[PDB]
A paper describes a structure:
The spike (S) glycoprotein of the coronavirus is a class I viral fusion protein located on the outer envelope of the virion that plays a critical role in viral infection by recognizing host cell receptors and mediating fusion of the viral and cellular membranes. The coronavirus S glycoprotein is synthesized as a precursor protein consisting of ~1,300 amino acids that is then cleaved into an amino (N)-terminal S1 subunit (~700 amino acids) and a carboxyl (C)-terminal S2 subunit (~600 amino acids). The S1 subunit contains a receptor-binding domain (RBD), while the S2 subunit contains a hydrophobic fusion peptide and two heptad repeat regions. Among these, CTD1 is the receptor-binding domain, and one CTD1 in the trimer adopts an “up” conformation as a prerequisite for the binding of SARS-CoV to the cellular receptor angiotensin-converting enzyme 2 (ACE2).
Numbering used by the authors:
A (entry chain B): 916 to 1119
B (entry chain A): 723 to 811, 832 to 1059
C (entry chain B): 531 to 660, 674 to 722
D (entry chain B): 290 to 385
Amino acid sequence: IQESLTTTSTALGKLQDVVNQNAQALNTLVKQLSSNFGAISSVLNDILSRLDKVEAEVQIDRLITGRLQSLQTYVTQQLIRAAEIRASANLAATKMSECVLGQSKRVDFCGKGYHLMSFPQAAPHGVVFLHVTYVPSQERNFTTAPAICHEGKAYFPREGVFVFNGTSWFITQRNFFSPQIITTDNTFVSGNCDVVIGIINNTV
Amino acid sequence: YICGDSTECANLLLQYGSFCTQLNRALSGIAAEQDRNTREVFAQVKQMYKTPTLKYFGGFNFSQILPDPLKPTKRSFIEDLLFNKVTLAICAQKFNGLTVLPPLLTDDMIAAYTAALVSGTATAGWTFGAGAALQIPFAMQMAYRFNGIGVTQNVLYENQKQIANQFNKAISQIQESLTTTSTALGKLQDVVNQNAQALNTLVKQLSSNFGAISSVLNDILSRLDKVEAEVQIDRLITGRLQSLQTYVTQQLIRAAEIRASANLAATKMSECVLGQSKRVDFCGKGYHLMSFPQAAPHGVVFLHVTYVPSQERNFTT
Amino acid sequence: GLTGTGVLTPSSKRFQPFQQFGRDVSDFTDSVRDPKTSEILDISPCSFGGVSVITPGTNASSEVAVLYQDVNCTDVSTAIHADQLTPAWRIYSTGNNVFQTQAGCLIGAEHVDTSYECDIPIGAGICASYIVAYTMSLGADSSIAYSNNTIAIPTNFSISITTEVMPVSMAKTSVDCNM
Amino acid sequence: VKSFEIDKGIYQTSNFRVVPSGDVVRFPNITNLCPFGEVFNATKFPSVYAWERKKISNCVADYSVLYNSTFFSTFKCYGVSATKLNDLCFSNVYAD
């Protein structure tokens, strides 16, 4: 993190995107002050120093009309950016409830993983998280047992799949390689031996 | 679009400031948003996969879901029906001024990403995405997915073949209920119809007058000389400017609705596909065993392997 | 009576003798009859389109490529070599013309079959590097095979804190009407 | 984009267009002086209720004596200019 945020670059870009949207909106607004709208000048009084009457007020009507429409366009795009920024803000409130105050059990929305914790940090105009996610990566080769057939009767494991049929030895999780001794206490009686596609005896 | 061309019009256009710059910036931003849309929806598995061509798993027919090597092309048959379903209403060479840009993502590779997602869904284990893949034979998948409803494999393996059957027929009935059917593939057509009518109405605005003599440039240009000229041309430019600004603002509002649905789109290709989304009547009207992506013109179409629990008893507690 | 600017070609109609014009979609002429016995279509888009610079970012390079949009990449050569482009440069001549994926001309980039993982979005699948212009490797293509019997568990793992940028408040602006 | 140091990427800029090459003007081979030297310089100048109407065709219009000689009290044009009128071929001028 003290790498990824500190010497680094535009992988924090969206907040500058927000500010650049503000700046281009506002600079566009100022440049519309610097623009004509079919009247003589781009700035008043300048004309009114050399304007007389009805000619004058027609040109000032032109300027006021154009200033008004440009301003209103600014208003509308601000409101649209406000709507988008607040849908994302509802997402921010969401992950600060969901992903912060607990572990948001929904999958691959908090970050890119299984989301062990989360740490917010403030920001200009925004918020930047630190998603304490999870990434499991090692790999293997192991063989199958969708059930357990000890005495001629089946044992579906605990459903939560892959019984450790690595040499038909134990029971296992979804994510971590884990030795689990079979007893009666660890699986459940489910009928006779019907479709035990991986058969394991001596399950006592 | 505006101002189509003469000489005088560009001068009278740059009278009105950076309006050309404003509109072109805003539509560039909308273009980049649609790029982001299709990236964030589809390109969510980085490390792609193979169409595995086992294609038969006890009885688990993925018929036509995946594009197949026996096909001439590489777009799957369901999606081919989808393409044929959806109408319109070298390059574009038309002096409206307009264009439909070509999309970013290659259309067959749109399909290839769908194939990747469906195939690694059909394989690879639950952990898929946050990792790569973990070697699970797909009946162990639904044996695992019975925990996102809270039941046993005594559902699955004690009823094995039957389950696949209720799979296959319904998918085949999908082939019925997408060939034979009607408006229940609506919203894509709705999107294209909105954009069709909006853009064609913009075209008709170029046919439209705004209180001027003509309603087309180069017409007045033979019988305009001076101040009369620029008055009529200012009327034309003013109206075309207002109409085009209206168009741009509505495109922006549409794109906002599209991106809220795109948030949903990523959410249902992540939550519904890559794991099982435990929330209720979010993915589908069941308890949501699986779901599969499918491509489409300008949009995505899911396939929700729901779960309708249906028989009835009476007991004492 | 008709002025304007465009690319002619002969007519392709069932053109009625009393008619003269074509106005095809909305008052857009597109087809006419010559006043000295010939019959011609008038596709007035000579060409147009936006251009766009493709640059590595003035911190390791200074060499551009110039994407043209609405062309089929032989019109551009005639526009260059009779000096017909409106952004008429001087220090500029054609390196090559990679063109398909119909987004238009691309001046100053090479085909590469060994397509990379797409820095920059040039139009329709095609992307750049360094400056080359390949189509796209869609990712890293991992072929995979998954039999029934064969399974693996992760045996070690990681933690991976990453960023995420959630905007909330824009600049709380305000505007005087009076000033 | 107003910077010396600019980051990497496709950036929008102006809109190019191929400048046209030459000139194509296409008229008929209709070649005739107008009767304007007599349809204006006429004899029978009628009443108002019995205003006269001629259709005149197959001609080539001049528009040149009308300006370099100020015989005329009121010149006025309505849907049209005055001087750039000698651009276009017309259908059936009407002397009223």
